[PDB]
Ligand SMILES: Cc1ccc(S(=O)(=O)O)cc1
């Protein structure tokens with residue numbers, strides 16, 4: 001649809017473009033809200049708004065309302081990688097309590113795995129799963145005990161994280177500055193300092209695009225000291 005092409009263009013734009021794409025799709029919800037191809041794009045635009053927003057209650061609102069649109073997209077059919085991908089993203093943005101993070105983390109893993117199964121050549125899903133695995137490996141003993149009681153035990157590993165981050169790089173070299181810092185962290189945590197230094201050098205080559213890109217520059221400067 002022309003509308004959905006315009007929304008795609010605006011999602012790929014600057015901050016002003018992403019805000020316009022959000023309002024463009026909201027303005028069209030009455031007419032197009034029964035269509036899965038519209039719903040996941042509206043969810044995506046909520047996710048854009050959540051990322052661009054600083055004020056905490058406003059950021060939360062975008063993630064909550066976006067997640068409901070992504071759920072409506074998934075009710076239309078289970079075979080859309082885009083539906084599962086953006087549901088996972090919003091799941092993670094909303095989950096930014098331990099009980100709620102655990103249930104969100106279980107849902108995140110199911111949907112990112114389905115996105116990868118449906119569309120394995122999409123680098124973003126692999127990056128998302130790498131970061132999930134890194135976070136799960138880094139849970140405290142108590143947080144793991146709490147997750148095992150609430151859910152199967154969690155057992156994702158630094159190697160699982162590394163393999164997913166490297167798959168994003170293989171599909172799209174330079175996909176993510178944060179991803180390169182996470183690869184370097186993973187190698188250091190494995191005791192592979194030569195590889196960690198290689199990826200630290202490559203991480204320094206990429207620009208910042210996300211809030212996390214800017215935040216993880218702290219971790220990258222700490223690696224330059226550690227290594
Ligand atoms: C396409 C488009 C451009 C601008 C806006 S507005 O920001 O709400 O006025 C909405 C939609």
Ligand SMILES: Cc1ccc(S(=O)(=O)O)cc1
Pocket residue numbers: 095101102103104105106132135136147154
């Ligand atoms: C399964 C699971 C549980 C908890 C987290 S957390 O968001 O890093 O706390 C992520 C994933």
